[PDB]
């Protein structure tokens, strides 16, 4: 019953250039909003917002850092160790993402996915290591192998099913002011690159809005134009978004058309901009 992000996750990107050269980049997120950075040299987190620690104490934050710090080092080490055994050709990248999310009703589901060479490799369903089809024999061998480690499994379980949920509620609450704010968008029209002699491309820009959900369409009166092509919702570094909505039209059919924008911050007052003769 609230807006803004409803989930948290940390990501990992580990690049292996050769048998003794590997680097790892990580960060913490609330949906698409980054709230944690990770300084590799000093295995310490970088808190991007005043409330990034959620309701956690400095002592527990330091425990988690230490945990990720040794995991990062150990992960690199074991990958280099089993590289040959797992028949791995350098260079290669391993990606990971783990977190949890709050669903309506109060349930919180956790998740964890790993990738090798940009393709699914594994994931964690109901507390177990599930190899991915694109993971081939490697994925099956790794999962089959990793589950034998009592220690790492118990830690993954705790982080995933006890710490993550507790952390989430704490940051969603601590950062409420920013996460649930409403920023009105600003729209403007422009003439895109002509699709051909006699044609024209109508462009509608919507920017600076937050939260992310938004509705933009080209209209003729109250008739939505089906040819309206949405662009990707792009980010502005200030926690707001940018979006284009285009419409390929004939020189004569331009007049009469308009761009309509709906957004939760508008409170029913849609932005309507008309194309002028």
């Amino acid at each position: 019953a609230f807006q803004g992000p409803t989930s948290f996750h940390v990501i990992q990107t580990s690049s292996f250039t050769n048998s003794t050269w590997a680097q790892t980049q990580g960060s913490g997120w609330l949906d698409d909003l980054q709230i944690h950075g990770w300084d590799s040299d000093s295995g310490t987190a970088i808190f991007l917002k005043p409330w990034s620690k959620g309701n956690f104490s400095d002592k527990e934050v330091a425990e988690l850092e230490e945990i990720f710090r040794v995991y990062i080092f150990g992960f690199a080490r074991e990958v280099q160790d089993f590289a040959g055994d797992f028949q791995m050709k350098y260079p290669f990248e391993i990606q990971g993402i783990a977190g949890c999310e709050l669903h309506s009703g109060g349930a919180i589901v956790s998740f964890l996915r790993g990738a090798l060479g940009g393709l699914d490799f594994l994931s964690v369903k109901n507390a177990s290591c599930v190899p991915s089809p694109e993971g081939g024999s490697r994925a099956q061998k790794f999962c089959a192998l990793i589950i034998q480690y009592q220690g790492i499994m118990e830690t993954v379980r705790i982080l995933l099913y006890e710490t993550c949920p507790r952390y989430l509620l704490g940051v969603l609450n601590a950062g409420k002011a920013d996460l649930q704010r409403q920023v009105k968008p600003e729209a403007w029209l422009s003439s895109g690159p002509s699709p051909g002699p006699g044609r024209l491309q109508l462009v509608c820009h919507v920017s600076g809005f937050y939260p992310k959900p938004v509705w933009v369409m080209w209209m003729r009166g109250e008739q939505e134009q089906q040819g309206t092509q949405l662009g990707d919702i792009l980010p502005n570094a200030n926690w707001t978004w940018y979006l284009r909505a285009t419409l390929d039209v004939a020189d004569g059919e331009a007049a009469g058309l308009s761009c309509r924008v709906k957004h939760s911050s508008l409170e029913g007052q849609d932005i309507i901009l008309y194309w002028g003769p």
Binding site: S27, P91, Q95, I97, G118, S190, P193, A237
Partner: protein
């Protein structure tokens, strides 16, 4: 070992208005592997003070990054974004089009 070329999109945070300070953005995404180099150019000269996001990726695991910098648009001054990536035999330049 897949390789995906980066999608490059350039845009200003606000509508272009010569004189008024704005923000130039270069969003590059859908690429893999992650190693990449991005530069925001001004008339072909790589801009100096440019900020960028820490690496991130989508659900399909392809990486994305936002490169930006506060800037003032003039009637002239052509801005663009330059990308180097294992998928490009040579740098790719995507100019900033105010009407796009």
């Amino acid at each position: 070992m897949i390789q995906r070329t980066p999608k490059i999109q350039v845009y200003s945070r606000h509508p272009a208005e010569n004189g008024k300070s704005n923000f130039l953005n270069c969003y590059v995404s859908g690429f893999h592997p992650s190693d990449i180099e991005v530069d925001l150019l001004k008339n072909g000269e790589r801009i100096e003070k440019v900020e960028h996001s820490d690496l991130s990726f989508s659900k399909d695991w392809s990486f994305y990054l936002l490169y930006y910098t506060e800037f003032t648009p003039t009637e002239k001054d052509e801005y663009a974004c330059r990308v180097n990536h294992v998928t490009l035999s040579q740098p790719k330049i995507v100019k900033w089009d105010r009407d796009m």
